[PDB]
Design a protein around this nucleic acid. Structure first.
Lengths: 45, 60
RNA sequence: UACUGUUCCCUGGGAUUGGCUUUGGGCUUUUCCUGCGCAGCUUAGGUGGAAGGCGAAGAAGGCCCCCUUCCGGGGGGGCCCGAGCCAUCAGUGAGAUACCACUCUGGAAGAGCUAGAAUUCUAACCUUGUGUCAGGACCUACGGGCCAAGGGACAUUCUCAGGUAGACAGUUUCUAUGGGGCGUAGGCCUCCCAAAAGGUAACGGAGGCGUGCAAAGGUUUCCUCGGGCCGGACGGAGAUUGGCCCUCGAGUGCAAAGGCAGAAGGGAGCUUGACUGCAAGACCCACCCGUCGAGCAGGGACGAAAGUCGGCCUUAGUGAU
RNA sequence: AGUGCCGGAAGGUCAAGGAAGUUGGUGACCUGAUGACAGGGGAGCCGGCGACCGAAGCCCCGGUGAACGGCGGCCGUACGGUCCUAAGGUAGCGAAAUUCCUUGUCGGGUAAGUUCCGACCCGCACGAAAGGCGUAACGAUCUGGGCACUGUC
RNA sequence: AUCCCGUGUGAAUCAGCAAGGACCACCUUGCAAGGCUAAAUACUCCUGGGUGACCGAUAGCGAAGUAGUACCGUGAGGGA
RNA sequence: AGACAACCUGGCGAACUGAAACAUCUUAGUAGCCAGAGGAAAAGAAAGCAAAAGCGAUUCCCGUAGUAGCGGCGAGCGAA
C-alpha cells in the first residue's frame, strides 16, 4: 500500500543546499525529526 | 470422457421471463457416445412449457 | 519419505527510516518521422474533410554535411540561385504526407508521472574505549553524562506474508480369521451346495459386473437359422452358388440361468414414448432401499385400421446423509 | 544414478502486497403497457473479477563418498560371447562372535574329540575408518590342551 | 452486523456523526472516543435468636479425652 | 506495607472427559496459580431498545423457550 510523508517545513539556518532562511518547501519527517529540529535549524507550520 | 450424459435444452422456450406464467426453459439430460455420433444431437421431444412437441437443441 | 501443527532458521511487503546525485526502466501529452510480396515515376498501414494548396509569411534545380537505410532511394541544416512547384490524368485490391480529420505499426527531442539501481553522505539506528567527567570518596567495578572511533538507513526489533528440521507436540495406524501373524477376502449379478413354496451357513464348488447401443431404441412390413451329404473354375476339412436331409442342436453386444418361431433371432421403411402430469393395486422386506403396474390427462410417433410405444428378451453396469 | 550437503547463469513455477482496466448493487432524473410494478439510470457510496510488476524455495546446472549409502546376471571353451547397471568388490581375510545345509572335507592333538588348532573356499549372507588385516604387552575376559595337586569321582 | 484488540493507514462536527444483523437509499432512534453513584443480588472462618419425620460414639466435623495431637515422612504432605 | 473462610474484580490458563476412535468442536474460559478490594463486588445513567405503535440508567427472579438460531448442521451449544 505505502504512503509518502509530506511535512510543512519553514526554515531558519541558510542550509547547505535548498534553503533561503525562509522557504515553504516540503520534505519527509526524517529531515525534521533526525537532522534539523534537534539542531534547531527549522520549525513546523 | 468416452460415453457422456449431455444437455438437451429446447430451441422452443428459449430463455424468457416476465408475466407470472413464467416461461422457464425445459431440459433433458441423457447419454450419447462422443466418439460414435460426433455431431451434436437434435432430437424432437415434448416440452411442458411450450405445450407442443418441440426440437430439443444440444449444447455443451 | 503417517496426518496435522508448533518452534529454530531463511525470504519478501509494511513501521523504525533520512539525503543528494548519474544511467536506462515502464506509462501519460506535445510534436516529428517511420513503416520497399505484386502493379511499378511510388523505402505506400487502414481510412477520410473533398479538389486548390503553396509561392515573393524571399522559390525550381543544386553545394557539402547531417538523420534513416530490408542500400531501393527517402528526409533535411544553411545558402550561391531567385519566386516556382503542380491534384484528378495512365498503371493498383487503395490514392497521392497539394491542405487536413482520425488512428495501427515503430521510433526521435522536450514535459510530467512514478519505479529500479550503484555509490557515498550522516543525522536515526547498532557497536567500541587501562578517552575523559565527578557526591564527603571510588568506576582498570556494572552502569550514567560528555567529546570521540567504526559501521550505517543496511542491520536489529514489531507486524503481515511464503518457504524450511520428528527439534518439539497432539493423534491416527480396520474387521473377518477354525489362537494371532503371514496370505486371502470385504459392494453387486448368475449357477450349484439348498433337502421339488420362499428362505438358508462355511476361509464350500463354479463364473461374471463397476457397461454398451442415436441404434443393438419405437413402431410398420418382410425373412428363417445352424450342421452335414451330393454337384460345381481357382477352392482344400472350410469363402461363394444350387439341390437334398434332421429340423431349432443357431443366434440373442458382454457370465450364467430362465426364455424366444414365421419369434424376443436376421433384414428393410419411417422416426424419437430414451415424453410431461400422475396412478387403483400388488411383490420384497428389521429399518433404509428395490420391483411390477391396469388406467386416466395432455401432446406426439408408426399404421389403412384394430392397436402398439413413458428405453433395451429378463436378471449385474452401483452408493445414503 | 537416488538421498544429503555445498555452490550456480537464463528459463519455468511462485505469497503477501500493489496495480491499467472490466462487471454488479443502490439511486436523483427521464420513461412504459395493462395490472399493480418495470426499463433504464448522472454524481456519490458500496462490494466483487484482475493485463502487468513480485523474493526465497522448488524444478533446472555443476561439485562432493574417513557425506547417508551401494559394490551384478546368463551362456560357451585360466579364456571368450551377451545382457543390465550409477558401479559391479581392489588389497586383505575366510566354514569366522559371521556357515543355514553342517558333526563340511582334509591334516594335528586324544585309546576314542558335534568343542579345539592349521589348511582348503561350495563367502546361504566378510571386506577396507558402522575401518581391513596383523601385533609385544596387559585381562576377577572368552575358549582348547598339559604338568603338579587333591574326597570332584 | 454489533463490541474489543496488534500491525499499517487515517475522517467529519450537529447542511454533522453512529445505530437499526452485509450493503445503498429513505425514515426512526440516539449522541462514542472524561469521570462518579445507594438499592434489590452473591456467600459463611464467624455473633446473637429460633427450628429439625437430623446424628448419637464404626454415626455426627478428621477431632464428645489437653487433635491436626500420637505417629510416619528430608520435604511438600499424610494422619489415627 | 502484612493477614483474612467463602463470595467478588482483573491477569494467565490446563487436561482427563464427551463426540461411542479423533484433529474442528466439547470439557471451559472451568480447575488451578497470580494480583486486587469490599461488605458486598461489578455493572450503571443511552452514540440504547423497538417498529411506524411505543419504551426510557443499571442489577436480580418468573417468563418467553429449550422457541429463534449456531453446529465435522455431528456430539452438542442456545439467545433476546
Amino acid at each position: 500500500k505505502k504512503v509518502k510523508k509530506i511535512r510543512k517545513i519553514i526554515l531558519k539556518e541558510d542550509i547547505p543546499d535548498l534553503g533561503k532562511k525562509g522557504q515553504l518547501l516540503d520534505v519527509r519527517a526524517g529531515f525534521l525529526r533526525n537532522f534539523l529540529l534537534p539542531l534547531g535549524k527549522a520549525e513546523v507550520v | 470422457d468416452v460415453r457422456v450424459k449431455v444437455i438437451l435444452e429446447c430451441t422452443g422456450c428459449v430463455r424468457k421471463s416476465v408475466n407470472k406464467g413464467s416461461r422457464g426453459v425445459s431440459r433433458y439430460i441423457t447419454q450419447k457416445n462422443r466418439h460414435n455420433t460426433p455431431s451434436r444431437l437434435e432430437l424432437r421431444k415434448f416440452c411442458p412449457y411450450c405445450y407442443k412437441h418441440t426440437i430439443h437443441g444440444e449444447i455443451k
